[PDB]
């Protein structure tokens, strides 16, 4: 799999987050597979809200996969962390 968020393009990362968020069973057929992807998400973003980005999102932004990505992108940019691979 991709190890670091800088290996994803933004579009690729959005599609992974949409898969987790919508519970796409083709990608996560088992509950155990979904849990792993959530743990992978928390690791990749390095964001201090972890899974709350997905399930308990801040009321100051859109509760959606795009809302999640934007929050992550803007937070990492603001900390000087590496960003998405260019598309």
């Amino acid at each position: 799999m991709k190890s670091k968020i800088s290996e994803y393009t933004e579009k690729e990362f959005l599609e992974f987050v949409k898969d987790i968020y919508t519970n796409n069973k083709k990608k996560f057929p088992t509950e155990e597979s979904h849990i792993q992807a959530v743990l992978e998400f928390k690791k990749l973003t390095e964001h201090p809200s972890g899974s709350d980005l997905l399930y308990y999102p801040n009321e100051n932004r859109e509760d959606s996969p795009a809302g999640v990505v934007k929050e992550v992108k803007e937070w990492r940019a603001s900390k000087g962390l590496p960003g998405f691979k260019a598309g």
Partner: protein, 131 residues
């Protein structure tokens, strides 16, 4: 297997709950089973505990009142039979989902699928009791 992982029928009564049901899962004794869910399940038979858990979260996710308390991400999990993820503040290591605990141990006489014997708890709160 565990003592709860047994065939049975749901019985018993839940309790009326508020607009933030799972707010109780992180304190005291846990969140009670909502009366509507105890009702929806009453008389249903389960082959094993995972069967019960699956039907329980599907029922929550279909309930007109309780489903308002969960975001679309969470419902996508619950509609499929999965428990919701807890808040980061309530995760306790590898345990990141709401758990259903028996108030009275089955070895001490407790009912396996008696709704008056069940609570929903977060991992952090469960460990506060049992570590």
């Amino acid at each position: 297997r565990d003592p709860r992982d047994v065939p049975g029928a749901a019985t018993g009564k839940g309790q009326p709950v508020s607009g933030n049901w799972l707010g109780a899962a992180s304190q005291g004794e846990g969140a009670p089973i909502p009366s509507q869910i105890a009702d929806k399940l009453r008389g249903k038979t389960f082959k094993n505990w995972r069967d019960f858990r699956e039907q329980f979260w599907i029922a929550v996710a279909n309930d007109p009142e309780l489903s308002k308390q969960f975001n679309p991400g969470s419902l996508a999990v619950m509609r499929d039979g999965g428990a919701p993820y807890v808040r980061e503040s309530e995760q306790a290591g590898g345990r990141i989902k709401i758990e259903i605990h028996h108030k009275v141990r089955i070895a001490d006489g407790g009912g396996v699928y008696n709704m008056g014997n069940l609570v929903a708890v977060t991992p952090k709160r469960h460990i506060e009791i049992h570590k």
